[PDB]
């Protein structure tokens, strides 16, 4: 497995007019996958991570908007990062952009950490369109290999035992860290649950406490939720995706939340700008921002 010219072929195509493919072979991928599923199940499932870094939100296959925010945030290991999932499905290219964030997570494992998405999932990524890239440009035997990996990505991160972070958002079944810390690996994301929620729960402005999710999966949560998790574990600040916000990040109660989405444009339905979040020596928070087009 030569991870320098799987990151050389993967980079080349910058400055390449958007939507030229880089295919790798399918044993090197199969090498991604199973390199990194190892060092995933070797580190912590809750992550504890230090700043600086950089916090990234969902990229959705945006291939080209991922090169974007490592030539504005540093390439790895320039600056350290935090994915907070969703990398795949609904873009062009979720295959070169899933084989860049695993091939930097074996090259550097202790300065690049990546979470899981609700679409970091089997049973989602075949309706919405992983499943299918897979089939098209290699095999379904692959996309198993995929979903094996998946299966093992840590599910949240606390950055300086202040800012906990994950795909979603809370969930009434977390009362203890270590609930999560108890999960094991591998696993699919369950239909309900403490799991279901990290990766699928989303705040919202007009709910009292906990409500009912129009997504069908998981629940809303408000403002008083998160500022009674904040005191309870001396938290200053929850940091989510999952959800497209126009500017890229959204705060929320008091900037005691922040949700961030880093695929512009997405999708070509939207036009929403993606965010990149700097986290500084002292957990101040800036932007870098990828304006829609
Ligand atoms: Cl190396
Ligand atoms: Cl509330
Ligand atoms: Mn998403
Ligand atoms: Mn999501």
Redesign the pocket.
Same mark, same amino acid.
């Given at each position: 497995l030569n991870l320098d010219s799987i990151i050389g072929r993967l980079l080349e195509v910058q400055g390449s007019r958007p939507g030229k493919n880089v295919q790798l072979t399918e044993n090197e991928i199969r090498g991604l996958c199973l390199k990194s599923r190892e060092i995933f199940l070797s580190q912590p499932i809750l992550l504890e991570l230090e700043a600086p870094l950089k916090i990234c939100g969902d990229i959705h296959g945006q291939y080209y908007d991922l090169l974007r925010l490592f030539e504005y945030g540093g390439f790895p290991p320039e600056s350290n990062y935090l994915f907070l999932g969703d990398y795949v499905d609904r873009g062009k290219q979720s295959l070169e952009t899933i084989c860049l964030l695993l091939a930097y997570k074996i090259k550097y494992p202790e300065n690049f950490f990546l979470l899981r998405g609700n679409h970091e999932c089997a049973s989602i990524n075949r309706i919405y369109g992983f499943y299918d890239e897979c089939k098209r440009r290699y095999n379904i035997k692959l996309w198993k290999t995929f979903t094996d990996c998946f299966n093992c990505l840590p599910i949240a991160a606390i950055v300086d035992e202040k800012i906990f972070c994950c795909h979603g958002g809370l969930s009434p079944d977390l009362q203890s860290m270590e609930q999560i810390r108890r999960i094991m690996r591998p696993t699919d994301v369950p239909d309900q649950g403490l799991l279901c929620d990290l990766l699928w729960s989303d705040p919202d402005k007009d *709910?009292? #406490?906990?409500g009912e999710n129009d997504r069908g999966v998981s629940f809303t949560? #408000?403002?008083?939720? *998160?500022?009674?998790f904040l005191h309870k574990h001396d938290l200053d600040l929850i940091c989510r995706a999952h959800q497209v916000v126009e500017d890229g990040y959204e705060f929320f109660a008091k900037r005691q939340l922040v949700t961030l989405f880093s695929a512009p444009n997405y999708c070509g339905e939207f036009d929403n700008a993606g965010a990149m979040m700097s986290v500084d020596e002292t957990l101040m928070c800036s932007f870098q921002i990828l304006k829609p087009a």
């Amino acid at each position: 497995l030569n991870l320098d010219s799987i990151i050389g072929r993967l980079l080349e195509v910058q400055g390449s007019r958007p939507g030229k493919n880089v295919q790798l072979t399918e044993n090197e991928i199969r090498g991604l996958c199973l390199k990194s599923r190892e060092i995933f199940l070797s580190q912590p499932i809750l992550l504890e991570l230090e700043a600086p870094l950089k916090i990234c939100g969902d990229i959705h296959g945006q291939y080209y908007d991922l090169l974007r925010l490592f030539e504005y945030g540093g390439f790895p290991p320039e600056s350290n990062y935090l994915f907070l999932g969703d990398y795949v499905d609904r873009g062009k290219q979720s295959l070169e952009t899933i084989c860049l964030l695993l091939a930097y997570k074996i090259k550097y494992p202790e300065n690049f950490f990546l979470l899981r998405g609700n679409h970091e999932c089997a049973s989602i990524n075949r309706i919405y369109g992983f499943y299918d890239e897979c089939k098209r440009r290699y095999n379904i035997k692959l996309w198993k290999t995929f979903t094996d990996c998946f299966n093992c990505l840590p599910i949240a991160a606390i950055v300086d035992e202040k800012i906990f972070c994950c795909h979603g958002g809370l969930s009434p079944d977390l009362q203890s860290m270590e609930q999560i810390r108890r999960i094991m690996r591998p696993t699919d994301v369950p239909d309900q649950g403490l799991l279901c929620d990290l990766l699928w729960s989303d705040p919202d402005k007009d *709910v009292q #406490g906990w409500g009912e999710n129009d997504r069908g999966v998981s629940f809303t949560f #408000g403002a008083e939720v *998160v500022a009674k998790f904040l005191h309870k574990h001396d938290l200053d600040l929850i940091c989510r995706a999952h959800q497209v916000v126009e500017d890229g990040y959204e705060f929320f109660a008091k900037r005691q939340l922040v949700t961030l989405f880093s695929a512009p444009n997405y999708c070509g339905e939207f036009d929403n700008a993606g965010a990149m979040m700097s986290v500084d020596e002292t957990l101040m928070c800036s932007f870098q921002i990828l304006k829609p087009a």
